[PDB]
Amino acid sequence: SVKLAGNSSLCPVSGWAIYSKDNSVRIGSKGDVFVIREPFISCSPLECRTFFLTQGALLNDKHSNGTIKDRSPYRTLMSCPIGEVPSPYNSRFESVAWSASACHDGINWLTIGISGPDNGAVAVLKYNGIITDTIKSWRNNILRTQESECACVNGSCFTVMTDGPSNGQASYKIFRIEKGKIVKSVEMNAPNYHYEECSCYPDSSEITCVCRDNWHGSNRPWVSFNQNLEYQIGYICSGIFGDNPRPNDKTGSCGPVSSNGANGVKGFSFKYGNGVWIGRTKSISSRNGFEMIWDPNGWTGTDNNFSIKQDIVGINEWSGYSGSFVQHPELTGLDCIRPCFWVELIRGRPKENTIWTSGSSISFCGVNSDTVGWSWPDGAELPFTID
Amino acid sequence: SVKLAGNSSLCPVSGWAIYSKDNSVRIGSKGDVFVIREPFISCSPLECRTFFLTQGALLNDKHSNGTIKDRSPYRTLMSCPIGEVPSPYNSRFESVAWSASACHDGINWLTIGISGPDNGAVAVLKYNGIITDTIKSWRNNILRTQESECACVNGSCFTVMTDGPSNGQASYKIFRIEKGKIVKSVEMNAPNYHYEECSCYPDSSEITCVCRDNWHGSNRPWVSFNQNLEYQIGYICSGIFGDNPRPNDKTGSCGPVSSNGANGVKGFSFKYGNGVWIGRTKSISSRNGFEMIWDPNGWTGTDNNFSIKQDIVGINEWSGYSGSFVQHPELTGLDCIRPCFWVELIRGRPKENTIWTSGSSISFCGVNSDTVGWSWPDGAELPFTID
Amino acid sequence: SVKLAGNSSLCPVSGWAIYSKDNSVRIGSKGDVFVIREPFISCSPLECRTFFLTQGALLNDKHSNGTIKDRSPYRTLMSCPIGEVPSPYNSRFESVAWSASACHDGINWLTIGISGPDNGAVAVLKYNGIITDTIKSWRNNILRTQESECACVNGSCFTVMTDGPSNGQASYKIFRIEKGKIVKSVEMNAPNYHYEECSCYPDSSEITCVCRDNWHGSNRPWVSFNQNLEYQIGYICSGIFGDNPRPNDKTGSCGPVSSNGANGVKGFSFKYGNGVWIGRTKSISSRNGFEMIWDPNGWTGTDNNFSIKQDIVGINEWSGYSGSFVQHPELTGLDCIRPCFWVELIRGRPKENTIWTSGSSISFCGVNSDTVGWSWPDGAELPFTID
Amino acid sequence: SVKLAGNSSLCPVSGWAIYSKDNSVRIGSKGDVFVIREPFISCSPLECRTFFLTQGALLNDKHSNGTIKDRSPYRTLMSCPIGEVPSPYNSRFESVAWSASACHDGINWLTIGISGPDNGAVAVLKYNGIITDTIKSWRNNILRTQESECACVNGSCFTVMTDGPSNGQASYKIFRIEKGKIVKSVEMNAPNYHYEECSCYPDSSEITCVCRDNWHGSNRPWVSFNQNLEYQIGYICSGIFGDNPRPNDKTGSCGPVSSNGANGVKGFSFKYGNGVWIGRTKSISSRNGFEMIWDPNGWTGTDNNFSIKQDIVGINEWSGYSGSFVQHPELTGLDCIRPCFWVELIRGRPKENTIWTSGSSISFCGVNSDTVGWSWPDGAELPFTID
Ligand SMILES: *[C@@H]1O[C@H](CO)[C@@H](O[C@@H]2O[C@H](CO)[C@@H](O[C@@H]3O[C@H](CO)[C@@H](O)[C@H](O[C@H]4O[C@H](CO)[C@@H](O)[C@H](O)[C@@H]4O)[C@@H]3O)[C@H](O)[C@H]2NC(C)=O)[C@H](O)[C@H]1NC(C)=O
Ligand SMILES: *[C@@H]1O[C@H](CO)[C@@H](O[C@@H]2O[C@H](CO)[C@@H](O[C@@H]3O[C@H](CO)[C@@H](O)[C@H](O[C@H]4O[C@H](CO)[C@@H](O)[C@H](O)[C@@H]4O)[C@@H]3O)[C@H](O)[C@H]2NC(C)=O)[C@H](O)[C@H]1NC(C)=O
Ligand SMILES: *[C@@H]1O[C@H](CO)[C@@H](O)[C@H](O)[C@H]1NC(C)=O
Ligand SMILES: *[C@@H]1O[C@H](CO)[C@@H](O)[C@H](O)[C@H]1NC(C)=O
Ligand SMILES: *[C@@H]1O[C@H](CO)[C@@H](O)[C@H](O)[C@H]1NC(C)=O
Ligand SMILES: *[C@@H]1O[C@H](CO)[C@@H](O)[C@H](O)[C@H]1NC(C)=O
Ligand SMILES: *[C@@H]1O[C@H](CO)[C@@H](O)[C@H](O)[C@H]1NC(C)=O
Ligand SMILES: *[C@@H]1O[C@H](CO)[C@@H](O)[C@H](O)[C@H]1NC(C)=O
Ligand SMILES: [Ca+2]
Ligand SMILES: [Ca+2]
Ligand SMILES: [Ca+2]
Ligand SMILES: [Ca+2]
Ligand SMILES: [Ca+2]
Ligand SMILES: [Ca+2]
Ligand SMILES: [Ca+2]
Ligand SMILES: [Ca+2]
Ligand SMILES: [Ca+2]
DSSP states (O other): OOOOOOOSOBOOOSEEEEEEEOOHHHHHTTSOOEEEEEEEEEEOSSOEEEEEEEEEEETTSGGGTTTTOOOOTTOEEEEEETTSOOOTTTOEEEEEOSEEEEEEOSSSEEEEEEESOTTSOEEEEEETTEEEEEEEOSSSSOOBOOSSBOEEETTEEEEEEEESOSSSOOEEEEEEEETTEEEEEEEOOOTTOOOEEEEEEEETTEEEEEEEOTTTOSSOEEEEEOTTOOEEEEEOOOSSOOSSSOOSSOSOOSSOOOTTOSSOOOOOEEEETTEEEEEEOSOSSSSEEEEEEEETTTTTOOOOOOSEEEEEEEEEEEOOOEEEEEEOHHHHOOSSBEEEEEEEEEEETTTSSSSOEEEEEEEEEEESSOOOOOOOOOOOOSSOTTO | OOOOOOOSOBOOOSEEEEEEEOOHHHHHTTSOOEEEEEEEEEEOSSOEEEEEEEEEEETTSGGGTTTTOOOOTTOEEEEEETTSOOOTTTOEEEEEOSEEEEEEOSSSEEEEEEESOTTSOEEEEEETTEEEEEEEOSSSSOOBOOSSOOEEETTEEEEEEEESOSSSOOEEEEEEEETTEEEEEEEOOOTTOOOEEEEEEEETTEEEEEEEOTTTOSSOEEEEEOTTOOEEEEEOOOSSOOSSSOOOSOSOOSSOOOTTOSSOOOOOEEEETTEEEEEEOSOSSSSEEEEEEEETTTTTOOOOOOSEEEEEEEEEEEOOOEEEEEEOHHHHOOSSBEEEEEEEEEEETTTSSSSOEEEEEEEEEEESSOOOOOOOOOOOOSSOTTO | OOOOOOOSOBOOOSEEEEEEEOOHHHHHTTSOOEEEEEEEEEEOSSOEEEEEEEEEEETTSGGGTTTTOOOOTTOEEEEEETTSOOOTTTOEEEEEOSEEEEEEOSSSEEEEEEESOTTSOEEEEEETTEEEEEEEOSSSSOOBOOSSBOEEETTEEEEEEEESOSSSOOEEEEEEEETTEEEEEEEOOOTTOOOEEEEEEEETTEEEEEEEOTTTOSSOEEEEEOTTOOEEEEEOOOSSOOSSSOOSSOSOOSSOOOTTOSSOOOOOEEEETTEEEEEEOSOSSSSEEEEEEEETTTTTOOOOOOSEEEEEEEEEEEOOOEEEEEEOHHHHOOSSBEEEEEEEEEEETTTSSSSOEEEEEEEEEEESSOOOOOOOOOOOOSSOTTO | OOOOOOOSOBOOOSEEEEEEEOOHHHHHTTSOOEEEEEEEEEEOSSOEEEEEEEEEEETTSGGGTTTTOOOOTTOEEEEEETTSOOOTTTOEEEEEOSEEEEEEOSSSEEEEEEESOTTSOEEEEEETTEEEEEEEOSSSSOOBOOSSOOEEETTEEEEEEEESOSSSOOEEEEEEEETTEEEEEEEOOOTTOOOEEEEEEEETTEEEEEEEOTTTOSSOEEEEEOTTOOEEEEEOOOSSOOSSSOOOSOSOOSSOOOTTOSSOOOOOEEEETTEEEEEEOSOSSSSEEEEEEEETTTTTOOOOOOSEEEEEEEEEEEOOOEEEEEEOHHHHOOSSBEEEEEEEEEEETTTSSSSOEEEEEEEEEEESSOOOOOOOOOOOOSSOTTO
């Protein structure tokens, strides 16, 4: 086994080829499939896995009742091979968690699972499934992390955590982790910024994270840093606003866009110089639809012009969280780090008249060969028999 | 790991010994078994797997409703060990796909999965589960491929794809693929021919494909080619017509037989000089029954005489698609490439009064020791509880 | 990997320690468990597996209807780790079969599966899951084999097959098989003998089989042979009669005991010089109960005295088939071949008012440390919901 | 593979970080989950597994009826990866057993499973799944063992067994086992002591066991010994009484505390010099709640003062058995033996109006980084459909 180098650049890509679809909710109508939310994908040098937060219950069973609820002692982080439904019969147990991150350094899996009370939550770090560290809430207000993969470079893995209000100034910390041990952390000096649920990826030995401002930004905040945790911060400038909810596209800002800025959804974007690939919902007001947009000056420019749009999920279909994942040269044999992404397709409450909330997933990888837009939605027929 | 040589000749065989039976539909009456169609078998140097197109739903569940439908965003290519039922608990995810092929070059699996809209479908190629190439519809009319294994020789794998009408002249291309990458393709110059759903196998370093003419042939078209994609084309001459539907046996043609020529079913045949092993339905009008026929001059001769017939499925039982698969010397230790075949046993719509359509499978391998004809049908009792 | 030597003697044992219990029928009341019968155990140098003939259906489903029937095209030989329930989710597919045998030579698994019509059945032999030979019915009257493990010595494996009447003189052949290929066979010259369902084990480089006389013997016939298939035949002499049905114990015979001799059950015994360990039902008239009896002169002596009796299943509980299996020094590290045995616990028809018939299993291994008699019965409560 | 050394000291710890939660009962409402009780965790150098005694039945099925019953021929010891629900689809079969222990010596698993009649039970010992020894009841009164992991040092593993009354003086033996073979045993000379269900761990080459006195002690008895089985005995002195039931905390005793001393629950404690980490229920009268208490002089001192309390399960929630497990340096890379523990969360009879009794589990590992108390209860809603 060898550490992932993480020193090559992100592969430029012209479109997105479909990689996986699990059909979890459709299958769970009969099969034994976990009620889940907050899924994400992460790869080792050998395989790619879907991680997810269970609700300690199965679809179409009474224990799925009330699963709109975000945090409980029953939620667990588990994983299964990409594209398979999350079932008790094919899933690896990772951690007890209502917020999580995970990533592979080339040698072993790092998992981070946060559980405990809202006023004193504890992140448990594991390396190869053995507890290696913990970090406890420092603001006593829902310690929370990425809900997507952490990022690794040369044996060090990096993540971001938040503690404090979701509707005002909070506290954001970056962590450097080696063999599951926190070896350095820094608090970001980001007055007037808000960071939640960062999607972080490696690119030329440094980490870029695109996150969710739940306080007052309808564009997405970003933070980038080197292995020594020297960081920079900003917001994506494009008038192609990335959050949900958001206003109709118009002139943007390199600071937080206040219009429709409260609340949000976990998302991601890939930076290429001044340009950016933005993944976003199609609806400006609800978690519906998904599309990928290439905006060649969208990282630093405020106009609402863009060059490419690719459909992923139709506007009349449910979407949800989305996040980046990468495939390193050690896995692919390429000379660059390949960008991929996943989308959570949320079914049930609050929009649908069920007793439960759960998601399925789709994923795509970037390529420079021909691609096509379409809609690959969840496809389940609600309500279910338990409803 | 070593590349399959693919340079020995096809083993001559006198009969077919039963190899597998999954009983998928019988078992799915209670168990958690995927609704599937278009199954096929393919082997590595170590094992044989059943590939199949799911409908993203389980048998005896409401989401099986309407599964007579051929293409949707929910269909996925998955695989499991040969003879096992396709379940979410034992199946490997391969690709999102409503048309597919797969084969192992001795090192890794190649999978090809076509998804997207009818007017712009995209084939996603994976090698060891990593996306390696794509090819997009060139006629904007249901890009489609084998629904059986591709064929590999010395590290190159080969397949055929079609784009265009199913009731008139279409476009047919041959592809050479190395480590999941298309390295060469050619369009077949086949005016008045129609090719779909080719069953292709290697034989002495060259590829032979026997396919389905849905336009105007009740005999089967074939195409054979070397590693440089220099090809020859024709139709099986035998008056023992191979397609379904078809006329009663009589004098055949080395061109497309127009009588009952429209429509068809995926099938296969094995060429041995002027002779041919033909697998076909027993019914001339419907997908019922299956038999293997040895016709010693049937490749090139038009008479309706034959030498051996072996029963596989009784005429009063449902059959469906069939296809070739081979076992290379690297797997068997033999000094020739062994021919095997599978049969899809289709249950449900349109012939039966159910809300769903799904198949089970049987397979056989060629031998020169004693064999026997019989009927190994699906055996499920319809309708099901859900109907 | 190395061939099993098979040259050490059978370990003498004073009692039987319980090794496994699967509770298949109890579990199948809810879980997805195959309807099975004719289970048996066989070991490699690394693990022990339960083989079984499915009925291509699950317990408590309508397709379990009529499963008292012995032969059909739906029956398949499959296997799972010892002690686990036979489910579609944990079972390896082996062969299509309504009669079977299997054994590991130290390198790979040999499986033998007989399918086809009663008047022309074909045994398909596989080595490492690849078809290596076939043998076809020579009397056109239900070709049939052990329903327990074959026996291996120095890279050669041995089995017995029968063809002909079950109520009169039939034909019995011994086979020597190497890497799945029949390299020698001989027909036993056994006028007035009847052999079915042999339980064969290796002992000092030679094979001993104890079988079922369905024609006219309530004691068990035996055949022993060396690697060159030079054989001897006889019947177990003990007045402790081994078959079911049978008379009450009395003076026995070294030939077939005619009293209650018609019909029978698959069983086994272990020879130790003049002595014998006999496994048998407790009831003389029905497949109820099970016990192990040590009779120190029972192989060659006709008296009805014995020295040890150990209870296995109570007389008021259902039993069924039983068979030997061994654990070689290559697996155990012992300096002798260890005798073990399994018992099939049959539930359903004809004795119970259900639509189905299925079995669970228990197994035991011989030891010289302390043991105890008890009853470890099936434990399912019939009828089931489907009945 | 290398033997565990077992020669380093127990890691001192300040708190307990949550390690696993299986949600078995919640999931078994729909999924195929074993009815179980007496679960425990044990690790190899590579992984940690949950062992458990099934009732040979699944949750929400009629065969779960009467499972309050402790011993039957249907109970089996099985195991699955830690944190996964115990299902027939993910569980390894270990032994037929209604009382058990297991542990890994660094090379292979030792399992001990006791079955048979109350008046003559037999413990079957397996090493790598092969029977290696047996030991039979010596007092003919429910031979019984730990229901948690045995302890290994330098290739020798150690356990404790009891035979005799649960309401008066019984007999207690210590065993030294090498490669599954009993190489030494001694009977403890413990008049007026009572030992059941010992929780034993290694610490500096010696074994410490903390057990259950069901006769007349509401504090816990202990026994410690070296590899030669030279032992010492006593009771935990702390006025923080460890058993359930028990009196309210007050001045304790270094002998058995008679007040509320009859009956009990399996538990554990970790000795650190004069100090002790005590895990106990929160209720003094019933199996409800769980907490960890650090009492710096509680091993040898009788006062009821303590320094740290950490909540694990709320007082209004069901708990049950608890036990120690360790993680050796060979697994963790640490320079000490890490203490962890599990808690069984018992649902059903006798406290709840169901036909069945079953448990789920949680586990924690000791650390010196920040931790938090909370309640991680079972969470199932009773009764179930079957009730
Ligand atoms: C699989 O699919 C088939 C086909 O969809 C499905 O059978 C259909 O069931 C639906 C719903 O029960 C039926 O739809 C009804 O049709 C009647 C006329 O026959 C209408 O009167 C009904 O409409 C009234 O009620 C609606 C709901 O309250 C109102 O919205 C509407 O305005 C009317 O007031 C309704 O449309 C339909 O008849 C059948 N179709 C067929 C061909 O049988 C089947 O149930 C599905 N199977 C499973 C397992 O899901
Ligand atoms: C799990 O076990 C419990 C306890 O066994 C079980 O509840 C029991 O159900 C049985 C069967 O329904 C009940 O037995 C009946 O009791 C009544 C008196 O209350 C008797 O009159 C009945 O006997 C008559 O009918 C029998 C059958 O026809 C005749 O054989 C008999 O001679 C009489 O004519 C019968 O015994 C019993 O009352 C309950 N017991 C309790 C405590 O509730 C439960 O059903 C089981 N659960 C599952 C899921 O299997
Ligand atoms: C990336 O890291 C690898 C592995 O250490 C190193 O060999 C290589 O020089 C680096 N690549 C570049 C482009 O600097
Ligand atoms: C969901 O939970 C609520 C709160 O306990 C309860 O009232 C209701 O019965 C539950 N609904 C279902 C369908 O179980
Ligand atoms: C087939 O290929 C193998 C492997 O390269 C080669 O050694 C051999 O010469 C070829 N066999 C024949 C018969 O040409
Ligand atoms: C058994 O076979 C082994 C392996 O070949 C051989 O070494 C040994 O001599 C034989 N044992 C006896 C007792 O003859
Ligand atoms: C069993 O099969 C018979 C014969 O077809 C049929 O009449 C009956 O309905 C079946 N019984 C059940 C319970 O399915
Ligand atoms: C513990 O055992 C190891 C392995 O044998 C040995 O090397 C070492 O000396 C021991 N450690 C201590 C602290 O005694
Ligand atoms: Ca926002
Ligand atoms: Ca722009
Ligand atoms: Ca045609
Ligand atoms: Ca001819
Ligand atoms: Ca007989
Ligand atoms: Ca005698
Ligand atoms: Ca089910
Ligand atoms: Ca007590
Ligand atoms: Ca104290």
